[PDB]
Ligand binder design. Sequence first.
Ligand SMILES: O=C(/C=C/c1ccccc1OCc1c(Cl)cccc1Cl)NO
Ligand SMILES: [K+]
Ligand SMILES: [K+]
Ligand SMILES: [Zn+2]
Length: 397
Amino acid sequence: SVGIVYGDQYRQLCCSSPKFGDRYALVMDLINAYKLIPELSRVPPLQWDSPSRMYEAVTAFHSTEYVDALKKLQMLHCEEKELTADDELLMDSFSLNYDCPGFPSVFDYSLAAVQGSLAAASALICRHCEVVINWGGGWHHAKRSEASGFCYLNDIVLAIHRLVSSQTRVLYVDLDLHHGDGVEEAFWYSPRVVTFSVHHASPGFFPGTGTWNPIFLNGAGRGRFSAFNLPLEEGINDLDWSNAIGPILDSLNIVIQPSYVVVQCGADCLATDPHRIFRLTNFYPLSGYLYAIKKILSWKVPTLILGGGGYNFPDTARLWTRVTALTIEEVKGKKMTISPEIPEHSYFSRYGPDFELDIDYFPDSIQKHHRRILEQLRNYADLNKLIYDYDQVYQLY
Ligand SMILES: O=C(/C=C/c1ccccc1OCc1c(Cl)cccc1Cl)NO
Ligand SMILES: [K+]
Ligand SMILES: [K+]
Ligand SMILES: [Zn+2]
């Protein structure tokens, strides 16, 4: 089956943040508006039987002082009084400030994503689902003891930790516009979780990594060569983005032979995102996103699909609704007939001006990256005693 994380309390918590507003409700109500929910198995967010078990779950990656500070931040932001100077100091020491402010539900909001993505991974492990989608998860910038980029708790790291502990290998694929630095760093020393991020990188552009450092770093210790990165230039369209990462994806799968794939599918690469770095689409005749997901799904490896960035809420909905239909098609083998106009539903009015499912958009260095990345993959194969034909992979490029 294809699983999808939602629930009534889950939806309220995913829509309680000041930055992402009601995005999750547009997304699930468009998936519902297109009659896709009956095709999907609902996966309920994981809950715990005590504070200690929750704490144990989250501090599998995050420090206990950080988790404590995040909960105290929520408590402070639920009272009238302003933070003391000592409380502002303590929040500063975890970067619980600026781009990661406090708000009345900040802890419950952050934990909800972890609940969602841990349950998603358990559904994969117990083989209840072949694919699970969590459009409320994917917060890849959060670090062990530091929020970043509106990511307070790294649900991806925790879901991946659960998967590899269930020899188990996980391939993480980060399609967000921005470098997936939190997940890469969590597994920097681990060869069993191979991380791969395609992203924009340029001087000054958040978060600064996943590019020349001048060498490309790629893991350390036993995780040497296990962190993959493909920084691309602004303006890239669907076909060039697809061709840039198509052969890398296929060769990673050939060589790593992963037990699970986790795909972060941040929607801020859309041409219509207020970022406007890349020019990808949701078009389905082809959308770089849809091309990448179809390819990963053709592998028939149990796969977690997650959300992430995406600041044009209706176009994120348009995209993720198409990705969700595509998953149903490739997994179940059932054709999905999506109408070209948005169906009438609660959020219909948000889909101005023409109320179509297509977004309103009219559409040397990568070969060096391919040679670099393919050499890293051989170094990874050699370091980890993996068996593969170096000519069947080089054929892909
Ligand atoms: O997407 C992110 C992270 C996004 C992000 C991080 C740091 C600074 C700005 C950022 O986003 C720009 C933005 C915001 Cl903060 C609000 C509205 C519109 C735009 Cl463009 N994770 O990978
Ligand atoms: K990325
Ligand atoms: K790694
Ligand atoms: Zn992003």
